[PDB]
Write an enzyme that holds these catalytic residues in place. Structure first.
Site, mmCIF file in Angstrom:
data_model
loop_
_atom_site.group_PDB
_atom_site.id
_atom_site.type_symbol
_atom_site.label_atom_id
_atom_site.label_comp_id
_atom_site.label_asym_id
_atom_site.label_seq_id
_atom_site.Cartn_x
_atom_site.Cartn_y
_atom_site.Cartn_z
ATOM 1 N N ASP A 89 13.070 0.986 -5.111
ATOM 2 C CA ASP A 89 12.581 2.551 -3.711
ATOM 3 C C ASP A 89 12.221 4.027 -4.058
ATOM 4 O OD1 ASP A 89 12.918 0.799 -1.633
ATOM 5 O OD2 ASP A 89 15.153 1.653 -1.141
ATOM 6 N N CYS A 102 -0.131 1.042 -0.151
ATOM 7 C CA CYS A 102 0.470 1.072 -0.243
ATOM 8 C C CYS A 102 1.235 1.547 0.807
ATOM 9 C CB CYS A 102 1.467 1.896 -1.787
ATOM 10 S SG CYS A 102 0.052 3.359 -2.392
ATOM 11 N N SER A 103 1.984 2.586 0.950
ATOM 12 C CA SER A 103 2.297 3.484 1.955
ATOM 13 C C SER A 103 0.757 5.074 2.600
ATOM 14 C CB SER A 103 3.454 4.939 1.790
ATOM 15 O OG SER A 103 3.717 5.151 4.049
ATOM 16 N N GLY A 121 -0.663 6.404 -4.769
ATOM 17 C CA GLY A 121 0.300 5.807 -6.375
ATOM 18 C C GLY A 121 0.112 4.385 -6.740
ATOM 19 N N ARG A 122 0.981 3.656 -5.554
ATOM 20 C CA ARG A 122 0.513 2.313 -6.762
ATOM 21 C C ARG A 122 -0.159 1.967 -6.408
ATOM 22 N NH1 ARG A 122 6.619 0.477 -3.167
ATOM 23 N NH2 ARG A 122 7.385 2.399 -3.982
ATOM 24 N N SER A 123 -1.071 2.140 -5.529
ATOM 25 C CA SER A 123 -2.804 2.018 -4.889
ATOM 26 C C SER A 123 -3.320 2.093 -6.744
ATOM 27 C CB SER A 123 -3.608 2.410 -3.991
ATOM 28 O OG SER A 123 -2.449 1.779 -2.213
ATOM 29 N N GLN A 127 0.623 9.497 -8.490
ATOM 30 C CA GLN A 127 1.735 10.401 -7.735
ATOM 31 C C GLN A 127 2.070 11.065 -8.289
ATOM 32 O OE1 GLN A 127 2.272 7.803 -4.544
ATOM 33 N NE2 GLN A 127 2.070 10.116 -3.149
#
Length: 284
Positions: free
Chosen positions: A181, A215-216, A220-222, A262
């Site tokens: 998280d 991702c959201s 970032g993660r993407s 990010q």
């Protein structure tokens, strides 16, 4: 400069925030006029994350062709990716329309539906074989065929049917379920294992349309996923693998979608993933 030595240099001098802000300052700025039209407000999850006009994916419909999604085309590496936000209640039908129209084989999901007690994207695929989903606005049917749950990721086989023509296609859903998280993973081992399973499936290969990764916000993660994949492929292709410059690759990708990577922690994690992954690319 060998990125492994660059890495130790930045780590010992504790300058990750400085390095990351330099990237933010040099990154491209292109217009995103279509994303900001009033008719598209409920098609965007975040006010400050929008696709550039020049690289946005267009839906094949005369009504409104807008989705928050970008084509990242990597010319030397010969890889393309579609990066998109987690679908919203009003855009789940658009999302599967895109997958169909772009001829994608795989969807890569890097978030959980709920994180930090809040919803990060819609429940956009079916959870039981016998309870299929119908998207009436785009005339598609989606069925769960099988599910394989592993310790760090889940892979699903899905059937997407164009109800207009009754053609069907198999889509693979690759769901990384253990990103924390807060922060980034302590080790890149499970993220790299996941990347290699996506590769092994064919979903990244030129016989298919571009993989869809989200991702959201889809930055970032993407961004970490596509940055690591492209850098490892370049180290395979070139005569001199130490010539691969992760900061330069990231700036190239940011010509196609804003904000990729990010935080400074995500930048450091991307370095760690490429450094550790190269100890297979270089032969092992």
């Amino acid at each position: 400069m060998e990125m492994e030595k660059e890495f130790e240099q930045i780590d010992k001098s504790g300058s990750w925030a400085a390095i990351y802000q330099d990237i933010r300052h040099e990154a491209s700025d292109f217009p995103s006029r279509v994303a900001k039209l009033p008719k598209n407000k409920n098609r965007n999850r975040y006010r400050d994350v929008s696709p550039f006009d020049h690289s946005r994916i267009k839906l094949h419909q005369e009504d409104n062709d807008y989705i928050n999604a970008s084509l990242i085309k990597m010319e030397e590496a010969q890889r393309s990716y579609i990066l998109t936000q987690g679908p919203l209640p009003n855009t789940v039908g658009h999302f599967w329309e895109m997958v169909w129209e772009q001829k994608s084989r795989g969807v890569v999901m890097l978030n959980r539906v709920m994180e930090k007690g809040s919803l990060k994207c819609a429940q956009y695929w079916p959870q039981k074989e016998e309870k299929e989903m119908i998207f009436e606005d785009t005339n598609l049917k989606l069925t769960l065929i099988s599910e394989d749950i592993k310790s760090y990721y889940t892979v699903r086989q899905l059937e997407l049917e164009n109800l207009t023509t009754q053609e069907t296609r198999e889509i693979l859903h690759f769901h990384y379920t253990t990103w924390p998280d807060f922060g980034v993973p302590e080790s890149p081992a499970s993220f790299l294992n996941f990347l290699f399973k996506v590769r092994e499936s064919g979903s990244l290969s030129p016989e298919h349309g571009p993989v869809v990764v989200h991702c959201s916000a889809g930055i970032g993660r993407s961004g970490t996923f596509c940055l690591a994949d492209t850098c490892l492929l370049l180290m395979d292709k070139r005569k001199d693998p130490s010539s691969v410059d992760i900061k330069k690759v990231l700036l190239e990708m940011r010509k196609f979608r804003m904000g990729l990577i990010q935080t400074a922690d995500q930048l450091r994690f991307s370095y760690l993933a490429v450094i550790e992954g190269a100890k297979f690319i270089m032969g092992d």
